[PDB]
Amino acid sequence: HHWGYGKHNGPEHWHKDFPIAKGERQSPVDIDTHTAKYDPSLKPLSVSYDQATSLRILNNGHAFNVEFDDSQDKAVLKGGPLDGTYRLIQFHFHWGSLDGQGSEHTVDKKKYAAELHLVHWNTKYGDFGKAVQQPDGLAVLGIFLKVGSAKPGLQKVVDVLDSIKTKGKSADFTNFDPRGLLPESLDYWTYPGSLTTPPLLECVTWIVLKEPISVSSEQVLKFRKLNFNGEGEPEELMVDNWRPAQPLKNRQIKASFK
Ligand SMILES: [N]S(=O)(=O)[C][C][C][C][C]C123[B@@]45[B@]67[B@]89[C@]1%10B81%11B698B746B814B562B%10%1143
Ligand SMILES: [N]S(=O)(=O)[C][C][C][C][C]C123[B@]45[B@]67[B@@]89[C@@]1%10B81%11B698B746B814B562B%10%1143
Ligand SMILES: [Zn+2]
Numbered sequence: 001h002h003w004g005y006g007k008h009n010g011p012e013h014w015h016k017d018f019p020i021a022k023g024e025r026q027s028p029v030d031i032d033t034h035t036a037k038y039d040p041s042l043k044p045l046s047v048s049y050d051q052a053t054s055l056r057i058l059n060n061g062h063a064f065n066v067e068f069d070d071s072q073d074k075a076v077l078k079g080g081p082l083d084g085t086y087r088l089i090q091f092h093f094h095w096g097s098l099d100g101q102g103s104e105h106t107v108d109k110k111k112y113a114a115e116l117h118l119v120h121w122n123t124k125y126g127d128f129g130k131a132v133q134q135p136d137g138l139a140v141l142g143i144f145l146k147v148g149s150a151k152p153g154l155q156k157v158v159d160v161l162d163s164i165k166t167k168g169k170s171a172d173f174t175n176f177d178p179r180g181l182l183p184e185s186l187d188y189w190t191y192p193g194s195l196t197t198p199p200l201l202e203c204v205t206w207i208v209l210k211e212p213i214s215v216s217s218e219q220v221l222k223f224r225k226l227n228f229n230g231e232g233e234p235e236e237l238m239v240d241n242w243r244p245a246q247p248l249k250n251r252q253i254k255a256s257f258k
Pocket of ligand 3: 094
């Protein structure tokens, strides 16, 4: 609708149009590493992206989405805390105006420079739109970004951003391999939560990887040249498109690792 990240339409305003913003399972959250309990019942995460077929990249005025063909069983997330099979539909990032902020989840109150979200829907609900209406409809794999060495697998994304500067622009983006965005380790934390953008639906199993990826300062600087505005509108840099941590309420965060 007209929500965004500014002083006048940002996270503190969202509840007026999306009252679930004050709900019982909102995301993101601070991950208190000492309180998160190791769960030996948790399985290794199975990330099967060998046949992923990226299609397009879109500036939607909030972030940019790299979209996948999800019409066949091709890029799936399984195992971990999940029951069943979840299909990759898109990924996007949240990032800051400065390297000291940008992530949505925090780790013992630490903010990372950015956070990648790989969004998957539970195939038992047939389509993404039906899945978001279910408490176990989505699985979002979250990966922190810190600034250091460049991430070679990110560069193809960085280089297409000049072609989608403004809201509503898209570009063909085929043959992109999202495996190049993963860290070495698949150790994770998990908890039940929500979309971090309106409509804030409480339909997500969050899986947040412990190990951040490193990206270069130049890579994140190019994220910060994107625009929230449309073409021919006053320039508003796309920065600080993150929701802050929300109350944990009656939830437990579980760790896959000791
Ligand atoms: N930051 S995050 O929690 O990873 C967003 C997860 C994916 C939301 C996609 C959408 B797409 B359609 B259904 C769900 B609602 B509509 B539009 B609205 B947008 B929101
Ligand atoms: N609850 S919500 O969806 O976050 C909407 C909150 C009020 C939106 C009103 C506006 B729209 B954008 B930003 C704020 B300034 B500019 B245009 B102007 B009108 B007023
Ligand atoms: Zn997100």
